[PDB]
């Protein structure tokens, strides 16, 4: 229903080099930017003799991304193949990284909450600053989708690119372990379950890429608990201050839990503290 302006979007097939599967395909794209001749980028593909509706979902999710324009924290779009000759595609920039969940599970090992000298002790380190700058850019661009009446409804870690110089995007590619009690049991999805998610997402980020419920059967006794008021237990790599973030976001009634905007400030706040601190821990040791 929204438009498709071609002369702005539209990117010839045989510019393009596909690469490895990632359908979503990584690929070389010859003169797609002003900036350089060559440049890797992420496409997504239908698959030879697909549904009519198929088709239309692909292109929906192409309209959505021109609509809501640019921002830094969710995947920006560079163009697209829609005309006739070959199959649709919607071309995104490549984050090197990939997916948040994976990354953060590589970098177990190599954590610390925050850097003092000798700094080379913690070269490419994760620090506290890391994790809550991850989750201050998601709420930032959650905030923007928020703002455009989308709702993504299938927020977490695995639907988090990381890119250079730890920049994170907001992407699409069991999904009850992220969904609200109403969006289990009414089937009702809005912004505010989105923050549900958000939650659910935080608490990756501060496990390091655990898998929510650890141990936990999924199962219609779940449901009952969640229902109910049962929590997650803070994960390993928690501040308090987080911790309840999380709990907030799980708010039994969907109304009480925070806006996106509030969780911008807030995480915002608790990035400058962090900050402020580190500065005091590197200046005394
Ligand atoms: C190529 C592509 C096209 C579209 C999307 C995508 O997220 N579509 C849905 C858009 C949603 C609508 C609201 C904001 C997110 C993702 C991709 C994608 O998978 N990009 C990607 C994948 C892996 C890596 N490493 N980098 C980029």
């Given at each position: 229903?929204?438009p498709?302006?071609?002369?702005?979007?539209?990117?010839?097939?045989?510019?393009?080099?596909?690469?490895?599967?990632l359908?979503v395909?990584?690929?070389?794209?010859?003169?797609?930017?002003?900036?350089?001749?060559?440049?890797?980028?992420?496409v997504?593909?239908?698959?030879?003799?697909?549904?009519?509706?198929?088709?239309?979902?692909?292109?929906?999710?192409?309209?959505?991304?021109?609509?809501?324009?640019?921002?830094?924290?969710?995947?920006?779009?560079?163009?697209?193949?829609?005309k006739?000759?070959?199959?649709?595609?919607?071309?995104?920039?490549?984050?090197?990284?990939?997916?948040?969940?994976?990354?953060?599970?590589?970098?177990?090992?190599?954590?610390?909450?925050?850097?003092?000298?000798?700094?080379?002790?913690?070269?490419?380190?994760?620090?506290?600053?890391?994790?809550?700058?991850?989750?201050?850019?998601?709420?930032?661009?959650?905030?923007?989708?928020?703002?455009?009446?989308?709702?993504?409804?299938?927020?977490?870690?695995?639907?988090?690119?990381?890119?250079?110089?730890?920049?994170?995007?907001?992407?699409?590619?069991?999904?009850?372990?992220?969904?609200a009690?109403?969006?289990?049991?009414?089937?009702?999805?809005?912004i505010?379950?989105?923050?549900?998610?958000?939650?659910?997402?935080?608490?990756?980020?501060?496990?390091?890429?655990?898998?929510?419920?650890?141990?936990?059967?999924?199962?219609?006794?779940?449901?009952?608990?969640?229902?109910?008021?049962?929590?997650?237990?803070?994960?390993?790599?928690?501040?308090?201050?987080?911790?309840?973030?999380?709990?907030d976001?799980?708010?039994?009634?969907?109304?009480?839990?925070?806006?996106?905007?509030?969780?911008?400030?807030?995480?915002?706040?608790?990035?400058?503290?962090?900050?402020?601190?580190?500065?005091?821990?590197?200046?005394?040791?």
């Amino acid at each position: 229903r929204l438009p498709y302006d071609a002369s702005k979007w539209e990117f010839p097939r045989d510019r393009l080099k596909l690469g490895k599967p990632l359908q979503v395909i990584e690929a070389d794209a010859f003169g797609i930017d002003k900036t350089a001749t060559c440049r890797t980028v992420a496409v997504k593909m239908l698959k030879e003799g697909a549904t009519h509706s198929e088709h239309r979902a692909l292109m929906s999710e192409l309209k959505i991304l021109i609509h809501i324009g640019h921002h830094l924290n969710v995947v920006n779009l560079l163009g697209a193949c829609t005309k006739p000759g070959g199959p649709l595609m919607v071309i995104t920039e490549f984050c090197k990284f990939g997916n948040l969940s994976t990354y953060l599970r590589s970098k177990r090992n190599e954590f610390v909450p925050y850097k003092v000298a000798p700094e080379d002790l913690y070269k490419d380190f994760l620090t506290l600053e890391h994790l809550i700058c991850y989750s201050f850019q998601v709420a930032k661009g959650m905030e923007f989708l928020a703002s455009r009446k989308c709702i993504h409804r299938d927020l977490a870690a695995r639907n988090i690119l990381l890119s250079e110089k730890n920049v994170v995007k907001i992407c699409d590619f069991l999904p009850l372990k992220w969904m609200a009690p109403e969006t289990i049991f009414d089937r009702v999805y809005t912004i505010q379950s989105d923050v549900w998610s958000f939650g659910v997402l935080l608490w990756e980020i501060f496990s390091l890429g655990a898998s929510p419920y650890p141990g936990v059967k999924i199962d219609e006794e779940f449901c009952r608990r969640l229902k109910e008021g049962t929590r997650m237990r803070a994960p390993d790599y928690t501040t308090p201050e987080m911790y309840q973030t999380m709990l907030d976001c799980w708010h039994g009634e969907p109304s009480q839990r925070p806006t996106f905007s509030e969780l911008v400030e807030h995480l915002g706040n608790l990035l400058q503290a962090n900050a402020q601190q580190d500065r005091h821990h590197h200046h005394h040791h």
